[PDB]
Ligand binder design. Structure first.
Ligand SMILES: Nc1ncnc2c1ncn2[C@@H]1O[C@H](COP(=O)(O)O)[C@@H](O)[C@H]1O
Length: 533
């Protein structure tokens, strides 16, 4: 049970307010989206232009391609303006957007399209061939839209159709609880589940949290994110547009820290958001060389922000990094807001919607200073911002509910002021830099190679990255005197060729056997614990 309005839509109820203020003279033409590719190309939309161009996107999707309300649309694009336009187009047209990384390989794509029964895919040059290798095995797939300077056989040209579309689209009166997005998300075993979010659980939640980052109406925010991470919708798109502020996007084709640094320095970015890895990469560059006195707000999420990183960023930039915490299923769950005291090692207090607590094995609230499982209260009232459940899987949504709480699956401690301290994943999920990684994903990849008879993938501390994927591998006898160095590279490349490279095992250790339960199941917890002093 939720306490929401009957109807909500981020495009019509927020974005178009800002456009209408411009049309009617109440506000000057303000920048909404500012994009750069780093090679001398830039593009900017004001809120009216964004409204119009996104209405053209809705018309392409629902008119030219005839996609109907409730249809599921896979979106697999790099950091190009068309991503923002296509997501907004889906929201208007009542279509369910399902973003994924351009890193994906064909088997990743097959899995997503088959599991979701996607009716359409919107892709770029990066994944054409990957999609086409598997498209014919997907009987629900009816539309393929390509965003590219090139035309290609079998694919509709998105850019050409966008330009032909009317700038007037009548926004669908979408319901608050109505499906708006599906984000695939990795689990402790098996393959990614489909996390469904509603019009309100993304957009109304965003409108309510708007400003938490310290951003204001006339500022520019840069969210540095894979376009497949829920972070991109929540912070790159909805936070700034809730406030009438500009969002900044850099193609960052190669994710180069020096490019990031010159960008911060050269453009009047007032707020920035990124995973801790971003900050750690910048701290290795020459900060003295590229100053950014316009930068005021530095926020982070996705991984644990080490006190070490916080301290160094302060020392070198004079700025605080304010940590936040969440997951795909819950969005922004805790944070350090602008006016809150920073506590090194602590990821903040409850987001305004949420009763976040530390809880015991029977579902009860624990006192400050005691370790347990982090949760959000969802009975008898589910707060605005929680997802709708895992699609086609009511059992696995039930499995994460304990008493009245949704379990985030992270251990934690709460202090005397309500600040949460992350104490590690309670299960086998791995966190490598941005990304959330399911051990079965990497294990399946590894098992396809003939040198691997048995394997267990787990998380491993790394002094330069924080946390990385490690594979323990039992070799077939005939590989026992290969060069371990060379074989490791081979297996690493193997994984990179069969699934999205972010999950490759950056460490491998060869062993004669793995630990097993009394019914033969591999004990990852045991290996993990060893790996961490
Ligand atoms: N501030 C943080 N500290 C530690 N872990 C985090 C933090 N933010 C996110 N995570 C991890 O990332 C998971 C969510 O990943 P995703 O659902 O891909 O956004 C959480 O359950 C945590 O395990």
């Amino acid at each position: 049970h939720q306490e929401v309005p009957a109807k909500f839509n981020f495009a019509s109820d927020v974005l178009d307010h800002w456009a209408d203020m411009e049309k009617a003279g109440k506000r000057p033409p303000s920048p909404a989206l500012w994009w750069v590719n780093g090679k001398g190309k830039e593009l900017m939309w004001n809120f009216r232009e964004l409204s119009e161009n996104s209405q053209q996107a809705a018309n392409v999707l629902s008119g030219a391609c005839g996609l109907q309300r409730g249809d599921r649309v896979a979106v697999v694009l790099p950091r190009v303006p068309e991503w923002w336009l296509v997501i907004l187009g889906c929201i208007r047209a009542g279509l369910i957007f399902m973003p994924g990384t351009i890193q994906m390989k064909s088997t990743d794509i097959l899995y997503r399209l088959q599991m979701s029964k996607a009716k359409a895919i919107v892709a770029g040059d990066e994944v054409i061939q990957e999609v086409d290798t598997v498209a014919s095995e997907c009987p629900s797939l009816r539309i393929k839209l390509l965003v590219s300077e090139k035309s290609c056989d079998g694919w509709l040209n998105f850019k050409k159709l966008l330009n032909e579309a009317s700038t007037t689209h009548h926004c669908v009166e979408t319901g608050s609880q109505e499906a708006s997005a599906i984000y695939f998300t990795s689990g402790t075993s098996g393959l990614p589940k489909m996390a469904e979010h509603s019009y309100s659980s993304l957009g109304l939640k965003a409108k309510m949290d708007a400003g938490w980052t310290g951003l204001q109406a006339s500022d520019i925010m840069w969210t540095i994110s894979d376009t497949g991470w829920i972070l991109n919708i929540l912070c790159s798109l909805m936070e700034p547009w809730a406030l009438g502020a500009c969002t900044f996007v850099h193609l960052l084709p190669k994710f180069d820290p020096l490019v990031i640094l010159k960008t911060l320095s050269s453009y009047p970015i007032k707020s920035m958001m990124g995973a801790p890895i971003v900050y750690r990469m910048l701290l290795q560059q020459d900060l003295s060389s590229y100053k950014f006195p316009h930068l005021q707000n530095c926020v982070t999420v996705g991984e644990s922000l080490l006190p070490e990183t916080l301290e160094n960023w302060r020392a070198q930039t004079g700025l605080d990094i304010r940590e936040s915490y969440g997951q795909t299923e819950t969005g922004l769950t805790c944070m350090v807001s602008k006016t809150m005291k920073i506590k090194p090692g602590y990821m903040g207090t409850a987001a305004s919607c949420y009763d976040v607590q530390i809880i015991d094995d029977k579902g009860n609230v624990l006192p400050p200073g005691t370790e347990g499982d982090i949760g959000i209260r969802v009975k008898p009232i589910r707060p605005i911002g929680i997802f709708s459940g895992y699609v086609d899987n009511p059992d696995k949504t039930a499995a994460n509910i304990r008493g009245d709480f949704w379990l985030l699956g992270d251990r934690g401690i709460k202090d005397e002021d309500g600040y949460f301290q992350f104490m590690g994943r309670a299960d086998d999920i791995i966190n490598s830099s941005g990304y959330r990684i399911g051990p079965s994903e990497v294990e399946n990849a590894l098992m396809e190679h003939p040198a691997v008879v048995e394997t267990a993938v787990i998380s491993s501390p790394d002094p330069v990255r924080g946390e990385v994927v490690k594979a323990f591998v039992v070799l077939a006898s005939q590989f026992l005197s290969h060069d371990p160095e060379q074989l490791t590279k081979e297996l690493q490349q193997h994984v990179k060729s069969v699934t999205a490279p972010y999950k490759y095992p950056r460490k491998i250790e060869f062993v004669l056997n793995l630990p097993k339960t009394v019914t033969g199941k591999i004990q990852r917890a045991k290996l993990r614990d060893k790996e961490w002093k």
